[PDB]
Write an enzyme that holds these catalytic residues in place. Sequence first.
Site, PDB file in Angstrom:
ATOM      1  N   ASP A 225      -3.389  11.861  -2.271  1.00 30.99           N
ATOM      2  CA  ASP A 225      -2.780  10.540  -2.288  1.00 30.99           C
ATOM      3  C   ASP A 225      -3.662   9.568  -3.061  1.00 30.99           C
ATOM      4  O   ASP A 225      -3.829   8.412  -2.672  1.00 30.99           O
ATOM      5  CB  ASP A 225      -2.557  10.050  -0.854  1.00 30.99           C
ATOM      6  CG  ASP A 225      -1.583   8.895  -0.768  1.00 30.99           C
ATOM      7  OD1 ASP A 225      -0.852   8.655  -1.749  1.00 30.99           O
ATOM      8  OD2 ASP A 225      -1.544   8.230   0.290  1.00 30.99           O
ATOM      9  N   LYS A 227      -4.305   7.011  -5.338  1.00 32.12           N
ATOM     10  CA  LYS A 227      -3.631   5.926  -6.029  1.00 32.12           C
ATOM     11  C   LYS A 227      -4.545   4.713  -6.016  1.00 32.12           C
ATOM     12  O   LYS A 227      -5.537   4.686  -5.288  1.00 32.12           O
ATOM     13  CB  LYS A 227      -2.307   5.587  -5.344  1.00 32.12           C
ATOM     14  CG  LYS A 227      -2.519   5.164  -3.904  1.00 32.12           C
ATOM     15  CD  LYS A 227      -1.260   4.640  -3.274  1.00 32.12           C
ATOM     16  CE  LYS A 227      -0.349   5.766  -2.899  1.00 32.12           C
ATOM     17  NZ  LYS A 227       0.918   5.238  -2.338  1.00 32.12           N
ATOM     18  N   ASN A 230      -5.144   2.833  -2.644  1.00 35.17           N
ATOM     19  CA  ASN A 230      -6.007   3.513  -1.687  1.00 35.17           C
ATOM     20  C   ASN A 230      -7.468   3.427  -2.067  1.00 35.17           C
ATOM     21  O   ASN A 230      -8.274   4.263  -1.661  1.00 35.17           O
ATOM     22  CB  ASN A 230      -5.610   4.981  -1.565  1.00 35.17           C
ATOM     23  CG  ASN A 230      -4.372   5.175  -0.730  1.00 35.17           C
ATOM     24  OD1 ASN A 230      -3.865   4.227  -0.131  1.00 35.17           O
ATOM     25  ND2 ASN A 230      -3.888   6.407  -0.664  1.00 35.17           N
TER      26      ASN A 230
HETATM   27  C1  LIG Z   1       6.188  11.897   6.920  1.00 39.44           C
HETATM   28  C2  LIG Z   1       5.770  13.375   6.805  1.00 39.44           C
HETATM   29  C3  LIG Z   1       4.342  13.616   6.271  1.00 39.44           C
HETATM   30  O1  LIG Z   1       3.765  14.687   6.475  1.00 39.44           O
HETATM   31  N1  LIG Z   1       3.807  12.561   5.616  1.00 39.44           N
HETATM   32  C4  LIG Z   1       2.548  12.616   5.159  1.00 39.44           C
HETATM   33  C5  LIG Z   1       2.266  12.788   3.809  1.00 39.44           C
HETATM   34  C6  LIG Z   1       0.947  12.826   3.354  1.00 39.44           C
HETATM   35  C7  LIG Z   1      -0.104  12.678   4.252  1.00 39.44           C
HETATM   36  N2  LIG Z   1      -1.377  12.712   3.819  1.00 39.44           N
HETATM   37  C8  LIG Z   1      -2.487  12.966   4.773  1.00 39.44           C
HETATM   38  C9  LIG Z   1      -3.747  12.210   4.388  1.00 39.44           C
HETATM   39  N3  LIG Z   1      -4.050  12.396   2.964  1.00 39.44           N
HETATM   40  C10 LIG Z   1      -5.233  11.602   2.665  1.00 39.44           C
HETATM   41  C11 LIG Z   1      -6.400  12.096   3.228  1.00 39.44           C
HETATM   42  C12 LIG Z   1      -6.888  13.363   2.916  1.00 39.44           C
HETATM   43  C13 LIG Z   1      -8.076  13.815   3.494  1.00 39.44           C
HETATM   44  C14 LIG Z   1      -8.785  12.998   4.372  1.00 39.44           C
HETATM   45  C15 LIG Z   1      -9.992  13.445   4.925  1.00 39.44           C
HETATM   46  N4  LIG Z   1     -10.005  14.663   5.483  1.00 39.44           N
HETATM   47  C16 LIG Z   1     -11.123  15.174   6.023  1.00 39.44           C
HETATM   48  C17 LIG Z   1     -11.093  16.433   6.613  1.00 39.44           C
HETATM   49  C18 LIG Z   1     -12.247  16.957   7.177  1.00 39.44           C
HETATM   50  N5  LIG Z   1     -13.382  16.278   7.167  1.00 39.44           N
HETATM   51  C19 LIG Z   1     -13.454  15.007   6.587  1.00 39.44           C
HETATM   52  O2  LIG Z   1     -14.524  14.400   6.592  1.00 39.44           O
HETATM   53  C20 LIG Z   1     -12.315  14.455   6.013  1.00 39.44           C
HETATM   54  C21 LIG Z   1     -12.357  13.194   5.432  1.00 39.44           C
HETATM   55  C22 LIG Z   1     -11.188  12.682   4.871  1.00 39.44           C
HETATM   56  C23 LIG Z   1     -11.240  11.416   4.275  1.00 39.44           C
HETATM   57  C24 LIG Z   1     -10.872  11.261   2.938  1.00 39.44           C
HETATM   58  C25 LIG Z   1     -10.900  10.009   2.351  1.00 39.44           C
HETATM   59  C26 LIG Z   1     -11.301   8.898   3.090  1.00 39.44           C
HETATM   60  C27 LIG Z   1     -11.673   9.044   4.417  1.00 39.44           C
HETATM   61  C28 LIG Z   1     -11.650  10.307   5.007  1.00 39.44           C
HETATM   62  C29 LIG Z   1      -8.277  11.733   4.675  1.00 39.44           C
HETATM   63  C30 LIG Z   1      -7.104  11.278   4.096  1.00 39.44           C
HETATM   64  C31 LIG Z   1      -2.969  11.782   2.182  1.00 39.44           C
HETATM   65  C32 LIG Z   1      -1.662  12.513   2.379  1.00 39.44           C
HETATM   66  C33 LIG Z   1       0.173  12.494   5.599  1.00 39.44           C
HETATM   67  C34 LIG Z   1       1.489  12.456   6.049  1.00 39.44           C
END
Ligand SMILES: *CCC(=O)Nc1ccc(N2CCN(Cc3ccc(-c4nc5cc[nH]c(=O)c5cc4-c4ccccc4)cc3)CC2)cc1
Length: 379
Positions: A225, A227, A230
């Site tokens: 995501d 963009k 964000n």
């Molecule tokens: C309505 C149906 C549906 O499913 N809708 C929907 C579409 C897209 C999304 N997302 C989920 C979040 N994603 C952004 C994202 C990606 C990864 C993280 C993140 N993950 C982890 C995992 C493990 N350890 C970590 O330290 C992580 C950190 C982060 C992270 C990344 C950036 C900033 C802060 C933290 C967080 C967000 C976009 C698409 C959801 C629902």
Amino acid sequence: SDVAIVKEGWLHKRGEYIKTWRPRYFLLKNDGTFIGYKERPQDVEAPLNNFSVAQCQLMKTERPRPNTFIIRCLQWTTVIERTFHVETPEEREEWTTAIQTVADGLKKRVTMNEFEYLKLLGKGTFGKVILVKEKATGRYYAMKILKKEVRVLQNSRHPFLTALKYSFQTHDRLCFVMEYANGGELFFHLSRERVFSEDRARFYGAEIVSALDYLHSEKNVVYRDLKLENLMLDKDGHIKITDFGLCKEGGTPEYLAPEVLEDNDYGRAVDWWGLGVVMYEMMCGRLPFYNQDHEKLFELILMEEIRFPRTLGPEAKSLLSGLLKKDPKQRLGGGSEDAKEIMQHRFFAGIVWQHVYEKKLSPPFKPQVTSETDTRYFD
Ligand SMILES: *CCC(=O)Nc1ccc(N2CCN(Cc3ccc(-c4nc5cc[nH]c(=O)c5cc4-c4ccccc4)cc3)CC2)cc1
């Protein structure tokens, strides 16, 4: 243990940005990856947690379409939902059982009154995001409130990612408290300055690359995501990628990678696409594609290509051209090296990446705030 396919077959996945159902061949491996492909997969990457069925609840409903099973997953602080459809009830049951087996097989003081609620940042199906102020500290945080019905592991900190500080749950809600940068929205800075200088974009670009590398190699997740909306700046003026994402039910698709629009297999290359769109806007003062018609906007991203202004330098041209390639396999950062492909690019010559991570590079822009508590960018 060795990773093998538990169950493979044709399913009807509901498109994430298209209401339509789409025939996709799915693979369910014992590592927990449930990935779907447009065509039967080439027999010939690293495991991404985006597709993991770990810690997911399966729900079989008959709405909006009979023989529907829904996978619901908590990924970091965001609940994602993937809806699938089969033809016969027997197929659904052997699919859910297979997934439930793998899912279980992979198992191997603070309250609401402590905060002050200023602004609704976003709302969603499974909860909302609220700009809050901790009464004690006087500091500003984003609280991600999720429906409960739907261990300090904070070695997840990174200079350019909004830190998830803590987590608490109320009666019926689960709340994620995370850092909120007060250096103002980056689109608010970009639109205010119209265009960023090539070197300035390099700065913001570098810090994003660092974070994406982190999410890919350490966390093995795709941001998906990426963009302009964000991206925020902290008081110092460094990049903070937000985590305020929510699932919503029922322009916007501009930041989307082509493979994502076509509901194919996507991987890390998606973030590099995202990176391309962002850096394109910073140096051009315009999105790559604009047209209103969603079918035309889709086809713009899918088949039409990206013009470059002559104001742009040749090093920036090679970078955006590679980042914004239609095919993820030909896309810069799309190979095994991932971010290394991008870090070794000539646009980032003279940029040492240990220094970017340690915030040694002097920010080209300083936000007008005395402190983090300065609400100058909120008003
Ligand atoms: C309505 C149906 C549906 O499913 N809708 C929907 C579409 C897209 C999304 N997302 C989920 C979040 N994603 C952004 C994202 C990606 C990864 C993280 C993140 N993950 C982890 C995992 C493990 N350890 C970590 O330290 C992580 C950190 C982060 C992270 C990344 C950036 C900033 C802060 C933290 C967080 C967000 C976009 C698409 C959801 C629902």
